[PDB]
Amino acid sequence: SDVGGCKEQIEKLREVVETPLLHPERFVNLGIEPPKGVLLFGPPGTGKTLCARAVANRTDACFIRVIGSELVQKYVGEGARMVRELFEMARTKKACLIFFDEIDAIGGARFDDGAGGDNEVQRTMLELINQLDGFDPRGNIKVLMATNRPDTLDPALMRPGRLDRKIEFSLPD
């Protein structure tokens, strides 16, 4: 009931996440196959609140939200363990949702002369995409993503293979 009048937006993102887990036998019957996930961004109204909608509309099993800046840490090599473990946890969590906020912080692309710099950043993003492109399962836990600007190109060029359904705000008509 907290929606601000957006109709096609909220609908098209409802069918990517809530309907597959609401009626799994339906899409499996008529499959084809549900999509992997979505991407949110644009003007601030309304960033990040649309996810709260999935929180209240979650049917049974709770889902996990993740803050972006905690991936990158001092003493490089902590993010490697970080990003890896939550995946295994999710696979035990049987279809539980994982959402990263402000991917633009850890999505710094691509290369500069010197000095790195982006090396410790590129590890985070690229290990993310590599572990996202694994074949087992992978991963049944679906995906959910949100940020501010469409940058950068590397994540933006890697998503359309593994992701779909990028919508733009809209924003009040």
Partner: protein
Amino acid sequence: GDLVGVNKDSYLILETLPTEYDSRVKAMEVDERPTEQYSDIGGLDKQIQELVEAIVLPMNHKEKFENLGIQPPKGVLMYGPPGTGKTLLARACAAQTKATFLKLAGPQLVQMFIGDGAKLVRDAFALAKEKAPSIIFIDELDAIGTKRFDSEKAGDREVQRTMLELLNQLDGFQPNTQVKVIAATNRVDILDPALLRSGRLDRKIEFPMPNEEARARIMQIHSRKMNVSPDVNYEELARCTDDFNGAQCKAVCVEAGMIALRRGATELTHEDYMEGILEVQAKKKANLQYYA
């Protein structure tokens, strides 16, 4: 050696037990076989032959090479933006060669502690020599093989030493001529010049956007499981795809079924396809005005 069994305070070794160590470092990843096969791709028939060659030819034709004095390739550089889709093809051909396949990710060499990646690579080719013949695959080599410029230092520098220790393994040691290893990068922007060798990267192919003929067939192999109305042009979509990718075509085949739910049609239609094309690409949205 090590692992020798000795009992508490007795300090006597009863037996010497093999082999090596340890847990995930011993076995990175156990890949039974991928489900995909080479029949799921199209338009790569010219460039898939160069990939299939370097891996298959050493296996069966060793008897031919001893007569012809031929040295088989080892590493092969496959690279491009998705897709392409190099990963799936390279893996799929590994089920057909029956050789043992070990999944390995590039950034895994980076660890919280020092010297881990070095020991890890040594431990990787260990069981590769034990499991010979076998196949090891790595991805995002460009990320862990950036040598920057000015010291000091590079965070990856321990992984550059580990990579240069790998190349050094193919340098000072001949036995690395067994158990081929495949590498793939998303972008050749940063590449180590030292990777040019028969045992290092040798076969190199630049993978552009798929041809129209290919984009038509690949989506048909993707939607061959789906129920489709027996009216499609195939030419239409192929011509209507610029800067598109083969994986974008899968996204289009799913988009066609996404609105089929609100359509109610149990069978997919021609117009649904082009609809889904214009949907996700190109971007959005604004409105049709000023163009009369």
